[PDB]
Amino acid sequence: PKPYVAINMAELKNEPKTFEMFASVGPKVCMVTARHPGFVGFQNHIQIGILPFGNRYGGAKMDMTKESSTVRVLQYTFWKDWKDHEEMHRQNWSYLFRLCYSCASQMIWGPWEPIYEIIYANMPINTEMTDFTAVVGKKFAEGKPLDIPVISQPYGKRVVAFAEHSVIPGKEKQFEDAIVRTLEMLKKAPGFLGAMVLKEIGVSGIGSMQFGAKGFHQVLENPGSLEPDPNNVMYSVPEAKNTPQQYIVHVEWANTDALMFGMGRVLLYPELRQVHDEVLDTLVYGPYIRILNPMMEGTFWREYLNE
Amino acid sequence: PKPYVAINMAELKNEPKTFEMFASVGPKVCMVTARHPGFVGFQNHIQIGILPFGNRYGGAKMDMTKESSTVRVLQYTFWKDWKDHEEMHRQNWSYLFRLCYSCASQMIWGPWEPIYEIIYANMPINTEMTDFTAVVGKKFAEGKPLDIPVISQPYGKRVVAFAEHSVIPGKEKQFEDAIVRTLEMLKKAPGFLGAMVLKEIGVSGIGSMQFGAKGFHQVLENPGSLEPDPNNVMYSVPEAKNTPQQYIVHVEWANTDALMFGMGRVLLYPELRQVHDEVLDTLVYGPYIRILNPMMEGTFWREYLNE
Amino acid sequence: PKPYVAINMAELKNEPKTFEMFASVGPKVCMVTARHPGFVGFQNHIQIGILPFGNRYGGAKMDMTKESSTVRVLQYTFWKDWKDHEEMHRQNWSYLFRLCYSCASQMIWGPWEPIYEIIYANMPINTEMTDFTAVVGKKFAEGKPLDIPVISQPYGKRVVAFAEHSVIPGKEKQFEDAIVRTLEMLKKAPGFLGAMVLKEIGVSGIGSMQFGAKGFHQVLENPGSLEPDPNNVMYSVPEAKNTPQQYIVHVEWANTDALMFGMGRVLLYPELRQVHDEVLDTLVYGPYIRILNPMMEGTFWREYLNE
Amino acid sequence: PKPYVAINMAELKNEPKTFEMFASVGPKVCMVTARHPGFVGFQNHIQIGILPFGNRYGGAKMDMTKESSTVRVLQYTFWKDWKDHEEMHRQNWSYLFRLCYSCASQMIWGPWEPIYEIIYANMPINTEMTDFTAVVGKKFAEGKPLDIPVISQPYGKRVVAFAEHSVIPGKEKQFEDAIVRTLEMLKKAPGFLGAMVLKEIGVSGIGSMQFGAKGFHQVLENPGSLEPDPNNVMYSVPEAKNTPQQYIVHVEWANTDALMFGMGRVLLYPELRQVHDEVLDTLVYGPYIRILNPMMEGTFWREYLNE
């Protein structure tokens, strides 16, 4: 079934020490998150660049990693029910806060953790290049050759277009209808590895370290080994939902060229351009497209998805 | 009277070519904006850093200019009526678009131009250190020594704390009441040069280059000398107003030390801390504090303000 | 169905500034071209070298990119009707001229834009290495395993042999019959990714910036933002068709070795050599074979082709 | 059928001279070992690193080859009957001792050669990337598409997780039952190339150069060309079997990322974590996971296995 998605976003210094801590602390946080039975997996990204759209963002390029002073992370965790995410944070707060806090020395902005519902998904299981023979054999054995997926390689071996949109109030239905039509056509592009549309339902105050006054002082004053009061979060997830309504259009690609020209198909192929124009007409903000590397992930989230 | 404020926000490459552009094109844009009789002035900032709040943002510091790969700009323009801003953009579109487009090669994100109403202002006219003798003389001559302001030096000779907040729906009144009480007490801190609270009323689609499909294609396809259709903006300013409600608390300081310890007075002076706690209890997001240098400005906006 | 092909040809300085231009302005031109409903896609090439034919062109090699002072581009655009190309240029002239002019500082020769009909095509859809599993699955599911194509990777991941020929007047039929027989045999060579034969039908004056006196002066005098009179083209497409008749034999290969020995099969395999000799007997000029890299492309042109 | 496994373990200096003698002497030893008809193949590994488990072993990493002063080898030989291994050593003692002894100048610890029974195996034949087409063709021809394996590339083109465990006396059955359930679920992880569980049955004294007094002196005094008395081994294989019972859980993976996250599936996927917890409850020691490169191998051992 479709899980809910929490996306933890932060910006940190782009230096070895940051990546070292990703390596020590990242796995620990994931292991703690997996204590909750509603956790169905995760997909953690580093932003490697920004789509320049010709020279609309002429200062950007798809891979800015060598020049950038910062690194942005977008950590997706997948949940049977979004409430599971909220419960997991609270039940495991002692561990999670202390692990999370340890990132402090490297932090510039964040964390900020909106929660999303998936309103459309066409996402395959991941497979390594070694797996495809057995996958093919099994699907033919089952008489289901249509269920043979593209090869979407895990652990940093493909790229993601993370396309931010906000929509004019009243035009949400038009946006949703048009974007699905667009993605249904986009799947013809070479190197297309899947797409999903995430619709924001709220924000996790606890995941964003956004407390009332009491918790704020506890965070600022923390030596690293004392929890802020997790009950001092002043708002529920839905209370923080944005209007204009925000969406992420998440599309995966074999490589950055396939991403650039593939995403470009909505601009270059007249038939698809006419359809995508209906999306553009609904926007307050966007599309702004971040190029992401899905480096660390729990690929079994797609197994839950495709049940 | 209180003007409305448009704040054009963008992120560009941090290199000499960007600053050279600022120098050529910036004055031109400012001169075009001044064609409209509702324009009452401007104050343009570059972000120099981020308040680390101890080590809450341990990777940040108040001056990151030597290390940062990007530069963020926040260009305030002040208007008798916010509709004047919208009219100015449309009446001068051929000049403004072509001037603003020229920044393309350096752009990473933006432009994004929210519009604000000022709900509280305690902001003096600017004066250079050469001016104070005459100011004092004139105020005593008029029998108004209470109207002698602090010396708030123009053109990059002071600093700004730009404090972002978003508020839980239903708590806007509590936020506004408490933040005013806070700023009324904060003005006792050494080196305090004034404060104002900006409340978002919407976003200028035209100023943010956010059009429907037609204009989007015109922007992407532009050689630099052809206007997108300014009538292709699909939303009015108020239609883009965010909920949760966004505010900027803008506070000016003699220098970054006065800023750090002065803003810190809300955390360190028990009496003020109790008051500021009432602000904290209302937040969905923030406070996140950007440190800005007001480099280029039309100081007469404060003359309009203090009429 | 078979589209018509316009091929815009130019020679430019081989330096970073040229490639930077390609990156900014290229996408813009492609997006403008896609405004016309007769546009079915594009395939843009840089020449990387020349086939030396042993030492017939002993000064050449298949990859001369490191040593060459110039770069030649051959930009294919595909059209339902060749008249669509002509209409598109005129309907979008203000954008296209200003975009294309911007390449001026780098130009040495061109542009020159002949138009071709496709008289033979055996060209597959492009696929990335990630796609083949799903392609295979779908073709078997449909009971069409014969329709499984070779893997022709898009975006610079294969090479093109661009073979120029001109034919003795009266021998066009002999050339066309023989070249088709040749290509039907050539498809047996390892790494063969497809072939088509293009027959010139004329030249686009407007695409070649070839005007009467009025437009010539407008071009030479242009500051970059004023269109030459697009009605000042003095000849129709067919009026410029060359005699001796010109053809391009366009053959795609997995890599430059497969190209060299594959194209070489017409010289080394006695059975095929005898057939290809019939082609050779008809020539005024050629074969001269340019080695091209198809870097930027709208792969959906092959979807139109293979309908 | 399932062969028995002897694993010869040693630690040597990490320098070119060591690898040079691997190259000269290794093939010779294998050729001698292959004189015995019970020999069914071999798989020789170098340890490249250690799984850090987050920062549990924070000084380790999966590839420590550039920094390590030593190299550990784990040489698996496979036998129809473990007694065949013992007979082979004795029948070929003059060759084997003199060959093995030549490694002396590089040795730091070892050799030590435990013997194992295989209690669970899910291990495919190896294939190179060139082989898969014919394997697929043959399996479909035989009507056995289920028997198409993953591509497990030989000769250092995949990696091994070598997971050491010792079990609380009395909990062997619980361990064995739970580990099999774990591995049956683990096979779903991307890049999984197979797994087996080895249960120690004893230690080869002769393979470990562990003699009584007489042989010990002969080893220490050896010029290199005189055999110690092979009849001076004072214990039989089973007499050296350890309690707590030792197991190796041997799991093969496409690459070190697939290994890290795949092995990690037992910690990150709640369903599998619950199962693997039953393994963890039985342990005296472990899991300690060595990362191995299977460099030199006789792949036909898997042909014997899968008969």
Ligand SMILES: [Fe+3]
């Ligand atoms: Fe979270």
Ligand SMILES: [Fe+3]
């Ligand atoms: Fe504006």
Ligand SMILES: [Fe+3]
């Ligand atoms: Fe053209």
Ligand SMILES: [Fe+3]
């Ligand atoms: Fe042995």
